[PDB]
Amino acid sequence: ASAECVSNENVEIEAPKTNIWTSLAKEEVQEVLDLLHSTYNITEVTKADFFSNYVLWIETLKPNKTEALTYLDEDGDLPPRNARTVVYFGEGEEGYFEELKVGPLPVSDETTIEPLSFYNTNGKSKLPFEVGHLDRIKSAAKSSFLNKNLNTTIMRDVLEGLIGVPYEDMGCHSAAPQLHDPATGATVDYGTCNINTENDAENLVPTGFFFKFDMTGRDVSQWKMLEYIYNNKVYTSAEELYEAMQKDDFVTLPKIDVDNLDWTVIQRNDSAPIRHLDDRKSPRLVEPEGRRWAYDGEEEYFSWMDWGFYTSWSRDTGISFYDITFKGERIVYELSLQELIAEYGSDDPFNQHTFYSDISYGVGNRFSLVPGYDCPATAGYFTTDTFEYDEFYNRTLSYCVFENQEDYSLLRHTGASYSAITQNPTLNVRFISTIGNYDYNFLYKFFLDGTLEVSVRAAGYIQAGYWNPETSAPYGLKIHDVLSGSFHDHVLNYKVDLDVGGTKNRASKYVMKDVDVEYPWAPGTVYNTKQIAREVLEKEDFNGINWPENGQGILLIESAEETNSFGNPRAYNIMPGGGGVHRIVKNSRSGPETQNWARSNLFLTKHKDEELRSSTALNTNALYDPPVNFNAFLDDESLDGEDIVAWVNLGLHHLPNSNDLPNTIFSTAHASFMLTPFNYFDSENSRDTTQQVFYTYDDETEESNWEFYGNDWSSCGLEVPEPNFEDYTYGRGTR
């Protein structure tokens, strides 16, 4: 019956400047790859080995900050357009990966190729083979080596006898990182076997069969199996284990029931009854009058309710944000996820040697978002791209942008014959990175007042461990017949380059404490009360900062000189949400210097172009001398009136239980922090939105009045649209 709601089309805009942080165009990558091929003897990755040279990566080397700001704020020149490339060189006496700068682009006679190392605290462009990237070539070699050893007549018999299925029915693989010893030069690695499945559930059927091997050097004929480990006993050869197994006293631990694996299946059971009313569609968010954010498609610049920002995408980390402005002023120069680790504790030599660096695998080289489900149907989707091993990957549905209506209002008050309520619509930018078993859901949520919330939720299949009743209990709960929910930490680092009221800032904390005082108006009477005291964080602190006990503090990044009208420094408060935790372990043999940012909740440093990133894709196996040692940034420099960067961590101490099988859920695996204005303005700045109501009641007449500021709530008809399911296809990008 009702008239149709008033439709409006999506709005596109022109960015104020070009996106100087954007990924390389296909043509730029091609020119660089061509130049690499004409400069060096380059072999195609599919034909390469440890003695070839081949190209791994080619991506944008982002501009330095000062040149970026000059361009953005002072009509300066476009910064130089350069590529970072990573090439493996095996032609020489020793193999190594080298980072090289190729630029400027487009390729011309001005273009040079030079060693690139300025952002590496270790000062090196070359990463030695022994601590090299676990790339396609090294992975294939390790796989071939494991097969060579595990598929002999003897080992086939040992594996089947212990595990209960033949070798064809399991998959053997290695722990990460590898373990290189700089003192002796040896490189060893542990591994395990899991039952093969058709539903990606291998991590739920680990067999408890382990091994250790020596993979030192580029000649694989010299690699050797060192140990087989089973039921906490060590065997130095296949033969020794085989013989042990023939003895009457040999103990074989309970085997996995591979005929009953329904408990690992995620999707719906066709025999399961529907809950009452679940035969009705769940609620849907709709936009009655169309989309309320705008964008420039060519420059990936976004605008929504006085916020602006550009996005950028990398293979290592996924999305990044640059030049985030609110009401025309920059609040954050760069906001960028840097690293995510997963560090296991266990009784067994596979999980106890697991300390993943997810950027080493790649966070930005995964799968598309599923419309309607991973993001609401009203989302818009964006394509990004990467380059790896000879192929340029186009990734559609890479990230999404949507306006939510939060289910609580932004503010309200009822009094004095009126009610004033302001709605809480938010802009949301999401991407989801499924890295093997885990699914990481990243969200950036912007609010009308100038507040931004950064969050992550995790789900997917856990990396469980075999349950041995004699030894597994201190490290996990028994969650299935022979399965432990191995204990681990997830920790993520974010580079938060706040520039509050300019680049020159101070960091301070309001410390809250109870104190005994006497007041002039009650002489002699002691009162126990509470006070605040502002403390300036004067210099970089090696210990970092941990959130105060009982929440007794507020952490601010202040403008050094700008104040509001009441004399307060303009500031933003870094407010922790859930997941304000850091690593429990302090001294890991699997990460001695490779992830040193993960030991406190947050760190504050002086901004430097050479301190670009807190980890690298090349860090994980370089245990003692990684390209970036985060601790090198902490060298007691003044932060008092300086360009400051906050490196903020979110984390989870995950101890999986029944509520993680078959999968972990996103609702209770959540971490977040907010950046909220604190004396940044003279008042709270959502007041100008039209998405609010002002209700008044007239005491004489007994007449109500409703002011909706141009929003007509009358019933109207709308089409609830089918999501773009057709745009989703399985896979990690189009090559």
Ligand X SMILES: *[C@@H]1O[C@H](CO)[C@@H](O[C@@H]2O[C@H](CO)[C@@H](O)[C@H](O)[C@H]2NC(C)=O)[C@H](O)[C@H]1NC(C)=O
CB 644 within 8 A of CB 607: yes
The reply to whether 54 belongs to the active site is: no
Q: Is the dihedral of CA 370, 371, 372, 376 positive or negative?
A: positive
Task: Identify which of residues 67 and 214 has a Cβ nearer to Ca ion in the complex.
Answer: 67
How many residues of this chain bind Cu ion (CB under 5 A)?
Answer: 1
301-304 and 703-707 beta bridge pairing:
unpaired
Q: Does 394 bind ligand NAG (CB under 6 A)?
A: yes
Binding partner at 118 among a copy of itself, Ca ion, ligand X, none, C-beta below 5 to 8 Å by kind: ligand X
Q: Which segment (265-273, 532-540, 565-573, 615-623) binds ligand NAG by CB under 6 A?
A: 265-273
Nearest distance in Å: CB 392, ligand X: 23
Binding partner at 637 among Cu ion, ligand X, Ca ion, none, C-beta below 5 to 8 Å by kind: Ca ion
Binding partner at 419 among Cu ion, ligand X, ligand NAG, none, C-beta below 5 to 8 Å by kind: none
Binding partner at 497 among Cu ion, Ca ion, ligand X, none, C-beta below 5 to 8 Å by kind: Ca ion
CB 644 within 8 A of CB 510: no
The reply to whether 449 belongs to the active site is: no
Q: Which two tokens stand for residue 503?
A: 């680049």
In the set 189, 358, 439, 449, the catalytic residue is 358
CB 23 within 8 A of CB 59: yes
In the set 54, 96, 356, 438, the catalytic residue is 438
Q: Which two tokens stand for residue 414?
A: 């009822």
Peptide bond into 104 cis (omega under 30): yes
Task: Identify which of residues 50 and 118 has a Cβ nearer to ligand X in the complex.
Answer: 118
Q: Does 428 bind ligand NAG (CB under 6 A)?
A: no
Using alpha carbons only, give the angle 89, 92, 95 rounded to the nearest 5 degrees: 50
Integer Cα distance of 600 and 546 in angstroms: 6
Is residue 180 exposed (0-12), middle (13-18) or buried (19+ Cβ within 10 Å)?
A: buried
Q: Is the dihedral of CA 45, 46, 47, 49 positive or negative?
A: positive
Contacts of residue 530, Cβ cutoff 8 Å, sequence gap at least 6: 512, 513, 514, 515
Q: Does 352 bind a copy of itself (CB under 8 A)?
A: yes
Peptide bond into 177 cis (omega under 30): yes
Query: In this chain, which of 92, 328, 524, 567 binds a copy of itself, going by CB under 8 A?
Result: 567
Contacts of residue 678, Cβ cutoff 8 Å, sequence gap at least 6: 554, 556, 571, 572, 573
Query: In this chain, which of 153, 543, 587, 701 binds a copy of itself, going by CB under 8 A?
Result: 587
Query: In this chain, which of 354, 424, 503, 596 binds a copy of itself, going by CB under 8 A?
Result: 424
Helix (H) or strand (E) run with residue 144 in it: helix 136-150
Q: Find the binding residues for a copy of itself in span 244-283 (CB under 8 A).
A: 263, 266-269, 272-283
642-654 and 487-498 beta bridge pairing:
antiparallel
Q: Find the binding residues for ligand NAG in span 81-120 (CB under 6 A).
A: 91
Q: Find the binding residues for Cu ion in span 645-664 (CB under 5 A).
A: 654
Q: Angle at which helices 153-163 and 238-246 pack, to 10 degrees?
A: 50
CB 146 within 8 A of CB 171: no
155 in helix, strand or coil? Answer: helix
Binding partner at 536 among ligand NAG, Ca ion, a copy of itself, none, C-beta below 5 to 8 Å by kind: none
Task: Identify which of residues 160 and 640 has a Cβ nearer to ligand NAG in the complex.
Answer: 160
Query: In this chain, which of 4, 7, 26, 722 binds ligand NAG, going by CB under 6 A?
Result: 26
Single out the residue of 348, 309, 313 nearest to residue 474, CA to CA. 348
Integer Cα distance of 668 and 663 in angstroms: 12
Neighbours of 7 (CB within 10 A): 11
Q: Find the binding residues for a copy of itself in span 175-214 (CB under 8 A).
A: 197-200, 210
How many residues of this chain bind a copy of itself (CB under 8 A)?
Answer: 206
Binding mask 165-204 toward ligand NAG (x if CB under 6 A, else -) reads --x-------------------------------------
Contacts of residue 631, Cβ cutoff 8 Å, sequence gap at least 6: 542, 593, 596
Q: Is the dihedral of CA 626, 441, 60, 452 positive or negative?
A: negative
Nearest distance in Å: CB 87, Cu ion: 35
Binding partner at 732 among Ca ion, ligand NAG, ligand X, none, C-beta below 5 to 8 Å by kind: none
Binding partner at 198 among Cu ion, ligand X, a copy of itself, none, C-beta below 5 to 8 Å by kind: a copy of itself
For the chain, give the number of residues. 735
Distances from the Cα of 63 to the Cα of 29, 72, 301, 350, 609, angstroms: 17, 12, 17, 41, 9
Task: Identify which of residues 51 and 725 has a Cβ nearer to ligand NAG in the complex.
Answer: 51
Binding partner at 51 among Cu ion, a copy of itself, ligand NAG, none, C-beta below 5 to 8 Å by kind: ligand NAG
DSSP H stretches of helix in 295-336 = none
Q: Find the binding residues for Ca ion in span 446-505 (CB under 5 A).
A: 497, 499
Binding mask 103-132 toward ligand X (x if CB under 6 A, else -) reads ---------------x--------------
CB 426 within 8 A of CB 406: yes
Binding mask 613-652 toward Cu ion (x if CB under 5 A, else -) reads ----------------------------------------
Please give the distance of CA 291 from its chain centroid, rounded to a whole number: 28
Strands (E), 6-52: 11-12
Nearest distance in Å: CB 99, ligand X: 12
How many residues of this chain bind ligand NAG (CB under 6 A)?
Answer: 16
Contacts of residue 221, Cβ cutoff 8 Å, sequence gap at least 6: none
Query: In this chain, which of 75, 93, 184, 730 binds a copy of itself, going by CB under 8 A?
Result: 730
Binding partner at 459 among ligand X, Ca ion, a copy of itself, none, C-beta below 5 to 8 Å by kind: a copy of itself
Integer Cα distance of 33 and 35 in angstroms: 5
Binding partner at 654 among Cu ion, ligand NAG, ligand X, none, C-beta below 5 to 8 Å by kind: Cu ion
Nearest distance in Å: CB 187, a copy of itself: 17
Q: Does 593 bind a copy of itself (CB under 8 A)?
A: no
Query: In this chain, which of 168, 518, 610, 637 binds ligand X, going by CB under 6 A?
Result: 610
Nearest distance in Å: CB 729, ligand NAG: 12
Task: Identify which of residues 562 and 609 has a Cβ nearer to ligand X in the complex.
Answer: 609
593 in helix, strand or coil? Answer: coil
Nearest distance in Å: CB 458, Cu ion: 6
Q: Find the binding residues for Ca ion in span 630-669 (CB under 5 A).
A: 633, 635, 637, 643-644
Amino acid at 400: C
Q: Angle at which helices 136-150 and 153-163 pack, to 10 degrees?
A: 90
CB 313 within 8 A of CB 435: no
Neighbours of 349 (CB within 10 A): 19
Q: Which two tokens stand for residue 466?
A: 């075999």
Query: In this chain, which of 18, 19, 30, 64 binds ligand X, going by CB under 6 A?
Result: 64
Query: In this chain, which of 581, 598, 617, 634 binds a copy of itself, going by CB under 8 A?
Result: 581
| Furthest C-alpha separation in the chain | 100
Q: Which segment (65-73, 264-272, 649-657, 688-696) binds ligand NAG by CB under 6 A?
A: 264-272
Nearest distance in Å: CB 227, a copy of itself: 8
Integer Cα distance of 492 and 652 in angstroms: 9
Q: Which segment (60-68, 215-223, 237-245, 345-353) binds a copy of itself by CB under 8 A?
A: 345-353
Q: Where do we find the tokens 């000879």?
A: 390
Which active-site residues does the annotation give? 358, 438
Binding site residues, ligand NAG, CB under 6 A: 26, 41, 43, 51-52, 91, 147, 151, 167, 262, 265, 269, 271, 383, 394, 396
Binding site residues, ligand X, CB under 6 A: 64, 80, 82, 118, 609-610
Binding site residues, Ca ion, CB under 5 A: 497, 499, 605-606, 633, 635, 637, 643-644
Binding site residues, Cu ion, CB under 5 A: 654
